[PDB]
């Protein structure tokens, strides 16, 4: 309808101009091909000229080569534009996609948004370009064919050129009728498919009550309804083209009957009627396809509207102002109420968890209460509804978001690795500011240089997708070195199962826990020997604060520590 | 390929034969159309015999009417086969689909299986039937047009007929080239899209670890690769058509060159060469689809293979022989080793849990420790790996699953309904064996009389989806009535909500009490009132019975009763 992706086309318009020129010249090539007929039939195969037949094979092969060359060039130079705007659209949408908060990736999954990166973006320039190609080529072919009509036979030129828009209208209303009946009937077909959907929704409560025999009879009736619906749908679909063919055949018969009159006859040669008839037959495909121009132009821009709404949404709120260099001081929580997104149930009560500087605070929960939820707030993934976290004696909403996530470091076994090299991965987003020797020695105090050696190249190898495939413990052995290099003010550690690295990876996490000896540690781990070693322990459950003290002090009302 | 759908299509053969005759007539409704050209020019616009031009409009309009009528009749009569071979496939893949264990409905989704009901089965009748509407029409049009050429010109028909398979082979090899390069470049493009997916996947990592400028640079250099890849794919797809057009145009020029190479040529009238060249270009469309038909026949049979493997799998192991009536003997778990299917972690240890007859046995599993998974053993939703459930003093393996599951009435607030009437829903699968008065009073002792009377037509009211739409507890109020109509020796009671929204009903729990007046009732619940009422209590966590006793006795040791 009304699209403002044209600025993204605005510098890339030379490709459009070249494609349009090549396409109108393709239409002219088709016109000249059809123009070839009259000398062949009138001069060539009528009067035995014998030179016409000599030089026509050459020009027809030349014109077919001209059709081929111009079609290939037009397709290449329109897909150049459809690639150079899809690339720009992908770049912009990707930027605003990584801009937006984590809630956007949730409730949508990482598979759909990829389709909105490649599927929707392709349709943006595979239905608009697919509309421009038609409206130019087959829209100017009609003009060329009517110029043929004016040139070679003016007598019936008037009759078919006045008749043609009426035929276009006929095809338009027939297509509209087909579209309407198909739409309403397709809604009905879905409305009966939901019956099968419900029937297969419970395979339970059919085996229990023992109703297999009854549950096929009803499905037999539903299948019969579906069959009748499908037969009516095909009838409606395959009556459309026949009636169109009949109304256009009335035009063909009208032209031929008009030719009966003496005045139009005897001025037109045997070849002239030939070219006008064959051209009229050729007119059907452009005349039919021009009507569906708006259809395809509203199947590419329609998806583009959804893509724009994805683009035009709001990035995460960044009213923060105070960049914090290093948050070594105490971190305090203050009457913070958080609600998980998409749910009215708050997963967090009014929580006051205070993290002492350089100390350990450990959360032990197997219920899935939200130990990860509280881990989210300190990194400001999901924001805070009411209350405040005095981060080194200052609110998060005062702190800039980039600075805040520069302070914190989240270590886990679900760590994702980019398609980079190992050296650029350890010093991620700061490899310019961190040296190679720093990365190496950081890996060394992170006691993780072993597997780094054991692959092909070592200090400069790829850590890419479908490449080395480090185990979860080994990926965490990269992750600990990341925060070790970065000198994170806060190191909120997670944990999962480990075998043959419980001896290693955890006692190496002593080396990250040397940064616990140097910095705070909001450890989220759920089972380890270090859990009892943890200085301060909280056992927060169902989003509720439960108990505060060391494990021996915590053993009082404790009934879950046993594991 | 090798398909045994023909047993399914055999009774629907007359429709197929009529469709074949109709498509043959449709193809012959092009050869006569082109046949009328010769007198229209040779006897018409050449030697001016007006009478030929007088009758020509009538015959062309009649022939187009014949084309339309026969095409519509063929489309109908190839939908009475495509509407009754898809129907039998749907029905026969329905009985053997709902007879399979619920592990099918795990490891899968209802939407996917519905797609295997509607879309996948529609391909079987729209690609394997699309290989019959196409091959017999466009294979008959070829024969008709060659017979035309032979009739009107014995001389250049031989040059066109031997030449035609060469052009067909050219089309086939070009299509194979396109297919190969397209599949390869599309696989590489997929290899790029998984990179895009991984960068989208680690959203949290890019947010937390630092800036996103390097991430945008990465996506710039991956979108450049995507754009170049797409341009090359389009280059292949575009250059497919011109080379075909050229290798056919050289045949066109060959025909025209041979149209005067010997002196015996040029004995053909203008109308005749017109007919032959119109039929030559006509040949392109059938000859460009007869080669492509095998792809459609292997795109409909391929999905039929998916349907066949879904159908041909196995239903429950039905080795039991005896039918217990009312299970007055106690149900009893004895040294049963069960594991959640799809996982190696055993959700059940070796559990010995006798259920005293006519006695309530409640269990509290708010840890999420597969309490519902214990509700599945007696119903045999997931089969027991090893060990015997000592049913009624005997083993359940000796009992028929259809009969055994009738001896269990599973009652839950997530109960599934149908598109039937509320009476039959009260007596589902057994409405013939239970009268309307029995249903009426059964609902009354269930305290379901009030609402079902407040609906449209009392007990005659339809309970269909998007109809009356009883609420959750109100939906429970029907399942309980289903259980009161006997068919309920054993009552594994779900009670998932335990949410007294409007105090529930005053007699929801009282209706269950009337249900639990006698009979084994292995109660699943979170309602502390029912646990207080419960006689035997087995609290379960992490797939093991931690305790057995009564309310105070079990309160004394451990206890999550604090909730
Ligand atoms: C006045 C204004 C208003 C009044 C109007 C009233 C009208 C009166 C009614 C009468 C006419 C109505 C038509 C009718 O009544 O019936 C038609 C029946 C045809 C004959 C019956 C009646 C004719 C006589 C009537 C009068 C009798 C007195 C329709 C039909 O036959 O079938 C229809 C058919 N049309 C023809 O066949 C006529 C065909 C052929 C007809 C020939 C006979 C006609 C003339 C006879 C008389 C001549 C003198 C009078 O050519 C034409 O059109 C016109 C050709 C004439 C011009 C030159 C003739 C040569 C003779 C010269 C004198 C001797 C149509 O073809 C498709 C087009 O494709 C190429 O384009 P490309 O460029 O490749 O991209 C061709 N390029 C070409 O051919 C170019 C030529 O090769 C060049 C030749 C190459 C060398 C020659 C080879 C020979 C060698 C072989 C020997 C081995 C086109 O040709 C064109 O237009 C271009 C045109 O040729 C250019 C002219 C060049 C010709 C050269 C001149 C001669 C040279 C000689 C020397 C000088 C060709 O038309 O496909 C439809 C459906 O197919 C669909 C499908 O099923 O969905 C639809 C499309 O897909 C779409 C969609 O749109 O929905 C879009 C896709 O993107 C995709 O999304 C897809 C999706 O996947 C889902 O589907 O959906 C499509 O794509 C296709 C595709 O294949 C898919 O796979 O699939 C069919 O419908 P359906 O079957 O009914 O359902």
From Swiss-Prot, chains A, B:
PANTHER family: ATP-BINDING CASSETTE SUB-FAMILY B MEMBER 10, MITOCHONDRIAL, ATP-DEPENDENT PERMEASE MDL1, MITOCHONDRIAL. This is ATP-dependent lipid A-core flippase. Involved in lipopolysaccharide (LPS) biosynthesis. Translocates lipid A-core from the inner to the outer leaflet of the inner membrane. Transmembrane domains (TMD) form a pore in the inner membrane and the ATP-binding domain (NBD) is responsible for energy generation. Shows ATPase activity. May transport glycerophospholipids. In proteoliposomes, mediates the ATP-dependent flipping of a variety of phospholipid and glycolipid derivatives. May also function as a multidrug transporter. Changing residue 197 to Q: Improves basal ATPase activity and increases transport activity. The gene is msbA. In MsbA the ATP-binding domain (NBD) and the transmembrane domain (TMD) are fused. Substrate binding induces conformational changes, NBD dimerization, and stabilizes an inward-facing closed pre-translocation state that binds ATP. ATP binding fuels a relative motion of the NBD domains. The movement of the NBDs is coupled to reorientation of the chamber, which binds the lipid substrate, from cytoplasmic-facing to periplasmic-facing through large amplitude motion on either side of the transporter. ATP hydrolysis is then required to resolve the outward-facing conformation back to an inward-facing conformation. It is a multi-pass membrane protein. Changing residue 304 to S: Does not affect ATPase activity. It is found in: Cell inner membrane. Keywords: ATP-binding, Cell inner membrane, Cell membrane, Lipid transport, Membrane, Nucleotide-binding, Translocase, Transmembrane, Transmembrane helix, Transport.
């Amino acid at each position: 309808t009304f699209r403002r992706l044209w600025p993204t086309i605005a510098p890339f318009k030379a490709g459009l101009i070249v494609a349009g020129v090549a396409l109108i010249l393709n239409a002219a090539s088709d016109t000249f091909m059809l123009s070839l007929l009259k000398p062949l039939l009138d001069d060539g195969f009528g009067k035995t000229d014998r030179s016409v037949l000599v030089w026509m094979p050459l020009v027809v092969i030349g014109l077919m080569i001209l059709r081929g060359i111009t079609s290939y060039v037009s397709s290449y130079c329109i897909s150049w534009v459809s690639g150079k705007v899809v690339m720009t659209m992908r770049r912009r949408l990707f930027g605003h996609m990584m801009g937006m908060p984590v809630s956007f990736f949730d409730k949508q999954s990482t598979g759909t948004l990829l389709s909105r990166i490649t599927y929707d973006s392709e349709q943006v320039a595979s239905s608009s370009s697919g509309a421009l190609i038609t409206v130019v080529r087959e829209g100017a072919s009609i003009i060329g064919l009517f110029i043929m009509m004016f040139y070679y036979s003016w007598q019936l030129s008037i009759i078919l050129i006045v008749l043609a828009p009426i035929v276009s209208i006929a095809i338009r209303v027939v297509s509209k009728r087909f579209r309407n009946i198909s739409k309403n009937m397709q809604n009905t077909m879905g409305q009966v498919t939901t019956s099968a959907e419900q029937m297969l929704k419970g395979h339970k409560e059919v085996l229990i009550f023992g109703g297999q025999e009854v549950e096929t009879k009803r499905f037999d009736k539903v299948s019969n309804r579906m069959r009748l619906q499908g037969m009516k749908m095909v009838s409606a679909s395959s009556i459309s083209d026949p009636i169109i063919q009949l109304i256009a055949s009335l035009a063909l018969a009208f032209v031929l009957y008009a030719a009966s009159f003496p005045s139009v006859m005897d001025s037109l040669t045997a070849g002239t009627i030939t070219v006008v008839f064959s051209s009229m037959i050729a007119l059907m495909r452009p005349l039919k396809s021009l009507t569906n121009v708006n259809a395809q132009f509203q199947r590419g821009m329609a998806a583009c509207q959804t893509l724009f709404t994805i683009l035009d949404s709001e990035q995460e709120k960044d009213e923060g102002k105070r960049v914090i260099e290093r948050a070594t001081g105490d971190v305090e929580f203050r009457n913070v109420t958080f609600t998980y997104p998409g749910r009215d149930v708050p997963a967090l009560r009014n929580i006051n968890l205070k993290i002492p500087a350089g100390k350990t605070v450990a959360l032990v929960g197997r219920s899935g209460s939200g130990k990860s939820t509280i881990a989210s707030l300190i990194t400001r993934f999901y924001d805070i509804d009411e209350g405040e976290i005095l981060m080194d004696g200052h609110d998060l909403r005062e702190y800039t978001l980039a600075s805040l996530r520069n302070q914190v470091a989240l270590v886990s076994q679900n760590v994702h690795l980019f398609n980079d090299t190992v050296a650029n991965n350890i010093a991620y987003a700061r490899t310019e500011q961190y040296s190679r020797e720093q990365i190496e020695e950081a890996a060394r105090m992170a006691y993780a240089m072993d597997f780094i050696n054991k692959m092909d190249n070592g200090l400069d190898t790829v850590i890419g997708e479908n490449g080395v495939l480090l185990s979860g413990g080994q990926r965490q052995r990269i992750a600990i070195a990341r925060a070790l290099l970065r000198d994170s003010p806060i190191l909120i550690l997670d944990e999962a199962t480990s075998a043959l690295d419980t001896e290693s990876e955890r006692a190496i996490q002593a080396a990250l826990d040397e940064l616990q000896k140097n910095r705070t540690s909001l450890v989220i781990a759920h089972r380890l020997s270090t859990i009892e070693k943890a200085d301060e322990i909280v056992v927060v459950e169902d989003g509720v604060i439960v108990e505060r003290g060391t494990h021996n002090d915590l053993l009082e009302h404790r009934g879950v520590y046993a594991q």
